[model samples]
Target chain A: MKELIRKLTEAFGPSGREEEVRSIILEELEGHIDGHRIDGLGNLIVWKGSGEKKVILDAAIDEIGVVVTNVDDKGFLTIEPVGGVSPYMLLGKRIRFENGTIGVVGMEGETTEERQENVRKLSFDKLFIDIGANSREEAQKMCPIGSFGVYDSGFVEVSGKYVSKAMDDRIGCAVIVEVFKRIKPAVTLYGVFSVQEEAGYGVPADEAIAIDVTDSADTPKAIKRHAMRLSGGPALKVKDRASISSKRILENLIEIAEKFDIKYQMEVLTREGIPSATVSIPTRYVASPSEMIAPDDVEATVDLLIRYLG
Target chain B: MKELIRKLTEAFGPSGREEEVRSIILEELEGHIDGHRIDGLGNLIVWKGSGEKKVILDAAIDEIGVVVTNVDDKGFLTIEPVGGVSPYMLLGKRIRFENGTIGVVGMEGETTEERQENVRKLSFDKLFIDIGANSREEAQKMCPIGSFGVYDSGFVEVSGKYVSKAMDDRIGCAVIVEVFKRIKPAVTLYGVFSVQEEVYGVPADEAIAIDVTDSADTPKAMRLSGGPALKVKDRASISSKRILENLIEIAEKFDIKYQMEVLTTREGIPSATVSIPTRYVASPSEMIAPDDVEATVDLLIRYLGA
Candidate 1:
C-alpha cells in the first residue's frame, strides 16, 4: 500500500491536462464498478447503483505543475505558478521541465522579512531557475513559452495513516470508489474526479451542475470548517453563499446526519465549495494532500441517504 | 453618394476590433433605414421589412495596414505586412505608423523591367522603412511593435469611377449600404458588413455560418460563371465558373452588356461574402473609384424581397 501510494504521489499531471493520473485511476476501477467515462471538460465520472437517493464523491486527477514564462541568458528559467505554491517552500527547490531539463528556483534579492512577504511579485525579473545554459536564445529554444514543470515531491504512508501528495482529493475520489465497491447501495451513486481544482474549480463545477438532473441535490464528503459547513459529509447545495439565512434546510441536513451516524464533517465555504456550488470563478491554489474521515461519519452518511430515499 | 463613399473608404478599423467604423456606418445610415441592430460579432443588420427568403448582402471593413516589426536607432523601420500585401508594392512607397510617424519602404535592389517579371521571390526580408528615428530606443517609443498605419493616397475621381486610397473592399460595404437603402427590400433582408476580408475572410466565414441558417442550403454563387465562375464580387468563394458564364448568358440573352473584366478568387474558401467590417484592408493604399451604375431600385428591391 505504501509503495502504491508513493507511485501515485510522484506522478505528473497538470492543470487542464490530466491524462497520466486519470489513466491509472481508470485502470484500477476498470471492471470493479458498473461504469466510468470522461466528460466534456475532461472530468472522470464513475457511477454506480440505483434508486431514490445519491452519494457523490469528488477529487482532482490534476496536479500542481509549473509553466515556463521566460528563459534568460546563462540558461536560467522564469516560471509561472500553475497551482498555488508557497514561495518559501518553492525557493531553492529542485524543479524539472518537460524537455528533461532540471533546475532550481533562486531569488536575486538579499534575504529580509519584507522581501519574503513580497515573494509573490518576485518574478523571473529578480529570480531565475538555473538550467545550465550560457545564453538566453539557447535556453529559450529548449524551454519555450507555454512549457510546464513540477516539483519532485512524493507521497508516503507513515504508520497506519496515509500521508501522500495529491491525497486531499484523490482520497475524496477514492472514497467514492470505495463506497460504490463495498455497499452497492440501492440509491444512485456518482463519483466525480474534477480537473483544474488547484487553479480553482475551473472545469469541475460545471461538470457537476450539467450532469445532474436535480437542480438541488447534495454530494458526498466535505470540509466542514472555515468557509464550508452545511451538514457536511461533502454537501450538495441548491444555492450558494448561505444567503438570506436559510435555516430550514440546515436543520433537515443536521437531523439526517444524526440519524445516519455517518463519518462526516461540516462544509462552511466562504468562497468555493465544490460539487454543488453551481459556480464559475477563479480561486486560490491551495490543494489537499491528505484527509481524515471518521468511520462513524461515513456510516452516518450512507444511513442518512438510505433514510432520505425512504 | 461619392461623399458617403469617401467617408467609408477612408475610415480606419482593425480585425477583432472594429467599433469606430461601426459607429461611423450607423451615424451615416441614420434616418435612412427603417431600423438596425447588431449581432454577436458586431455586424450591423439593417432591416427594411419582415418577410421570407432573406437576401444577405455582405462586404468587408478591414484594410491592409503595417506593423512595426523592428526599429533601428539610425531611423530605419522593419515592418511586417498586416494582411495580403505584395513585397513589390511596398518598396519606395511612403507609409505611416499608428503614432503618425512616417517612413519609406525601401528596395534592396534597383528595379528594372526584367526584374519586375521575376519579383515573386522578392519578399520583405531585406526591406526596411526609414523614418527620422535617431536610435532604437527613440524609434520604439515613437512606433512600438503592433502599431499600424497605411498609405495616405487621397481620392481621385474619374468620369464616373472614383479611385482613392484603401478602397479594396470598403467600396463593397459602401455599395451594399447604398443599394440596400435605395431598394428597401421587403423580405428577410440581411446586410452583413464584415471584417478581415483582405486577410482572406478569416473571421467572416464563422460569423455568417453561425447566423445564417442557409449556409448549407445556399448554392455555390461562383458556379454559373465563365469556366465555373469563382464569385460575383471580388475574391470571395469559388463560384462555379459555369454559373458566372450563365449570369452573362442570361444578361446577354436580354441584351445587357452587364459585365466587366475582373478577378476570380483562387484562394476563396468561405466568409468574405458577408461584411463584419475590419480595418485591415491588406494593402497600404487602396485605389478604387466606383463608377455610377444604372441599377434599378425596383429591380433590386424585388430581387431582395422575393
Candidate 2:
C-alpha cells in the first residue's frame, strides 16, 4: 500500500491531463476488479460484488499544476495557475513539464527590496519560469504555450510520515485500491479513480464518498485551527464549502468506526461539491511541493473503509 | 487639460485593444505634434524636436481588463484576467465589453458560507460574468469568446479630485499632451503613448514612464496634492540616477510640491515613472488630484525647457 501511495503520488497528472496517472492505476487494478471502464472525461470506474445497494467511491487522479501562457524573447516562460497556486509558494520552486523539461520559477524584480515588494503583492503575471533556454525559439521548442507542468519534487519518507507532491488525492487513490483488494461487499460497489477533481468535475452515485486529503492543523502556526492532525487517522466529512454530508452516511461511518475500534476523526473542511461525503486523509502543507501524511493514518483509513464496506 | 484628461480616462483601451485610446490621443496631438507613427504592437510614438540627446517620455495608453475564455450554456461568460486583477475586487463589479455590452461579475457557490469560502480562496475559474443573456447562443452573439472588457464606470468630479476607471496611465497621457503643448526642448523629445505597459510592454532610452502610482494619502502612504511622484525605485527598475537627480534639482529649483514613491514594475526598460498620485488604483473608481496632474505637467515642462 505504501509503495502504491508513492508510485501514484509521483505520477504527473495535472487536471485535464490525467492519462499518465490513469494508466498506472489500471495496471495496478488489472484482473483484480470484476470489470472497469474509462468514462468520457477519463474517469476510471471499476466495480466488484453484486447486491441491492449501489455505492460509489472516488479519489481524484489529478493534481494542481501550471499552464504556460507566454514565452518571452529571453526564453523566460510566463505561467498561470491551473488551480489554486499562490505566487508566494511558487517563487524558487522547480516545475517539471510533461516532456521532461525542468524550469525554476523566478519573479521580475532585480533587487532584494524590489523582490520583497513583488513577493508582498505577488501575482502570477509577475512570475516567470526559466528552463535554461537562452532564446525564445529554444524555449518554445522545449515547452510552448498551453504546456502543463507539475512540481518537480520527488517522494521521501521521514520518521513515520511520508512526504511528496500530489499526495492530496493520490493518498486517497491508494486507500480505495487497498479497499478493493480486501473488501467483498454484499452490496454493489463502484471504485472510481476520478479525473479533473482538482479542476472541478463531478460524479453522481446512489451513495457516494470522496476519499481525498484534508488540511491538517498539526503544524506550528497553522491558521485554519482545524481539528485534523497528521497521525489522527481518517477524517469523516461533516461539511465543506461545497455540500453537507448525508446524516445517514455520517452516522453509519461513526458507528462502524466505533464497532471496529478504529482511531478516526471528523473533518469540516473550508474547501469543495458533490452531495458526497469525504473520507479524508489528514495531510500537512496541502497544495505545496512537500505535502506530508502519516503512514499510520493511511493504514487506519484502509482498515476503516474495509470494515464499513465489508 | 482637464477636458483631455476626462476624455482619455473615459476611453475604452484595455491592453492589446488600445486603438480607441490611441485615436483620441492622436486627435488631441493632430496639429501640435510634428510626426507620429504606430508601432507593431500598437504603441503610438510622436515626436516634436530633434537633437543629439534624445529623451523618450512614455505614458501607457493601455489599462488592465479581462478577456472572455468560456461562455457557458446559460449565457454566462467565464473570464481570465488579462492583467493583475484580484477576484475580491471583481465581485459585483460591472464590465463593459468592446461591443458596448455590459456584464456583472458573479461567483459560484450555493449558500452564503459557500460563497464566503469561495471568495476567501477565489481564483479566476470560480468567477463568471453575466451579460443578462438567457442562453449560450445569445451570450455569444453579444460578446463572443476572446472578447475584451473594461470597467463599466464613468468619470466624475468630487470635491476637487477626479474619479474614473483608467486614471492610472490616462492621467499620465493627459500630462504628456499638456507638456507637448508647452515645452520646446533643446534635445529630441519622443512623446510615446505606449501600449501594453500594464501587460509588460516596453520602450527604450533615457526612458521615463509618466504614469499613476497608488496614493497612501487616505489612510495609506503617498498623499494627494503632493505634486507628481518621482520614482525612487519600484519592483522592476530603479529610477536612473541621472534622471532622478535632474528631476529633483528641477523640482527644488522651482519649489514644486513633489513626493517620492516605490511602486510595482512596468517592463524591462531602464526606466522610471513620473507618477500621479491616484487613490483606489486598479479598481472601477480610481481617484486623482487635478493639482497633481497640473504639477506633473509643470515639472515636465520646466525640465524640458531647462
Candidate 3:
C-alpha cells in the first residue's frame, strides 16, 4: 500500500494526454512484456501471453485535467475539462498551467442577490484564471489543444497525511505497476492502460473488453450514510453506484481478506463511476472514493496474486 | 457487362442476409482475393488483391422491398420499406408478399386526390395490402420484420422489351458488375451496388475516407420534363435551368433532335413514396420506362471502362 500510494502519487498523466504515464509503466515492464501498441484513441494496449486462459488488468491513465476550449476576444482563456471536474473542489483553488503559469480558479456569475433565483448555468464562462497576462491576446497564445492545466499544489506532507494535485487515479496506475512488479500470476494477465477515463467519470471505455473501476471512498456523501471517515485506512469495496458486484470475484477477494486477517473495513458506495462502466452497460463491484485500500493493504493485494486466488 | 448484369439480377439475398453474396463473389475472383469481413453494420467488404494498397467494395445486399409495419384490424397490412419503394406504383397493383404469403396492395385513402390537395401524410401505415390470409390474426402470426413485397405485374414484353418491377436501379447493380469483368485498373476499385439506394439516403452521413464519388444529377422533380436525355454526354454538366441550351449545343455539335419531358413536382404522397427527402430526380427524363433502365446499365459500364 505504501509503494502503491507513492507510485499513484508519483505517476504524471493528464486527461486525454496520458502518453507520459503510459510510457513510464511501459519502460518498467520491459523484457517481461511481449507486445504493445497505442490505439487510435490513444489507449496503450500491452499483451504478454495470449490464447484462451486470459485475465486483464485495465487501468486508466486519464485523470481530471484542464483543456483549453476557447480563448476570448480580449485574451482571457476559456477552459473546460478534458474530463469530469467536481465543481465543489473547483472554487478558490490554485491552478497550474502547462507553461508553468500559475493562476486561481473560481466559477463566475450569480451575484449574492441573484443566488436566490434558483438559476443554474451560473456559467463557468464568466470564470477566468488570473495568469497576470498583459491582455486577452497574450493569454490566448498560452493554451492550445494539447496544452494541459492541472492543480497548482505539489505533493505535500501534513503530519499524518500526504496530499497532492491528482491523487485519484494516479494512485490506481501505481497499483497496476506494483502488481506487475510484484507478481507473475500463473495464468496470462494483460495490463492495458487507456486514455480519456476522467471525462466520463473515470472509466475509459475499452473498444476491447473492459470491466469497471473504483474511486475514493472519501467522497462527500458517503460520510453521511455510512459514518465513514475521509482518511487513511483500508476501505474494502462491495459495490459502487455505477457498477454491480461480480459475486464470485468479490466473494473470492473477501475470502482471501478474511484468511490473511488484513486490517480492512467493508466499503460499498451508492453512486460511483469509472470508464468501463460508462461506455459498457453492465459492470460489477468497485466503489469510489474507492473504499480506501491503504498503502499497506496493497501488499495483501499483491499477496493474493502471488498466493493465487486459490 | 452481360455477365455482371446476369449475376447481380439473379443473386438471391436480402438486407441482413449477405454471406451468400460474399461466398459467391469470393469464388468468382478465383482465390486472387486478399481480405474481407462483415462489419458491425451489414456491409460486404472485398479487398481486390493488393497488400501494399487499401480499397473497399461496398454493395447493399437488400433489395427494394416492403416491411410489414402494421396490420390493420380489417386485415389490411400497412407496410414501409425494408428498402426504397415508390408509392405511385402501389395502388391497385398485385404486390407479392415474401413471408411465404401473397397479397394485393392498395392505398387506404384516396391517394391522387389527397396528394393533389397536399393535405395528407401518406405513410405505409395508412395503406392496406390484402394478403391471402383471411384475418388480422393470421397475418400477425405469419409475417415478420424483413418480408419483401413486389409489384403484381410480371415482366411484360412491350415491343420486344420487358417492363417489370425491381428495374429502377437493379440496372445500376448490373453496371457495377460488368465494370469488374472487363477492367483490371492500376488502382484498387471499389464496386459498390449499394442497398437502400431507392430511399433512406443513409450514405449522406456515412463517413468514408473516399477521395471521390460519382457526381450525381437528379431533377428538381422526379416526373418528366422533356429535354435531351443524356445529362452528361461530355465534360461539362448542365444545370436544370440551363437544360434546354445543353441539348441545343449537343444538337449543333452532333446533329441530334431533342424533346421535352413534362413532369410533376412531387412523386406522390410524400410518406408512402420511395424517394429521398432532398433527392431531385432528372426533370427531363425521370421514369426510365423499360428501355431506359437497360440503356442506363449499358452506358454506365461503357462510360467507365469503354
TM for every model, in the order presented, reads 0.40, 0.50, 0.45
Each candidate: chain B TM-score: 0.66, 0.90, 0.52
The residue-by-residue lDDT of candidate 1 on B76-150, one tens digit each, is 676776766777677667875443467777755556863554455676666777777678776765666666767
Identify the candidate with maximal TM-score.
Answer: 2
What is the full ranking by lDDT, best candidate first? 2, 1, 3
Candidate 1 lDDT score relative to the true structure: 0.49
Return the TM-scores of chain A for each candidate in numbered order: 0.63, 0.91, 0.69
Lowest lDDT block of 10, candidate 2 chain B: B196-205
lDDT of 1 by residue, A66-130 (tens): 66544545677766566655555567777766557777788876769756755867554465677
DockQ, computed on Cα atoms, for candidate 2: 0.02
Per-residue lDDT of B1-306 in model 2, one digit per residue for the tens?
Answer: 878977898899888777668767866776677555444456666666534345678887878888888889898988888767677778899988776778898888888789769866789999988888899877777886788888888889888889998898899888888888777766557777765553322123467788788887766157898788887773443447667888899889988999898655434545667788898888888999998888988888887764
The 10-residue segment with the lowest total lDDT in model 1 chain A? A210-219
Best by DockQ: 3
| Residue ranges of candidate 1 with Cα displaced over 4 Å | A1-9, A50-57, A96-101, A109-124, A132-142, A158-161, A197-257, A269-310, B1-306
Chain B alone, TM-score, model 2: 0.90
Using lDDT as the measure, the top candidate is: 2
Task: Report how large a share of the reference interface contacts model 2 reproduces.
Answer: 0.00
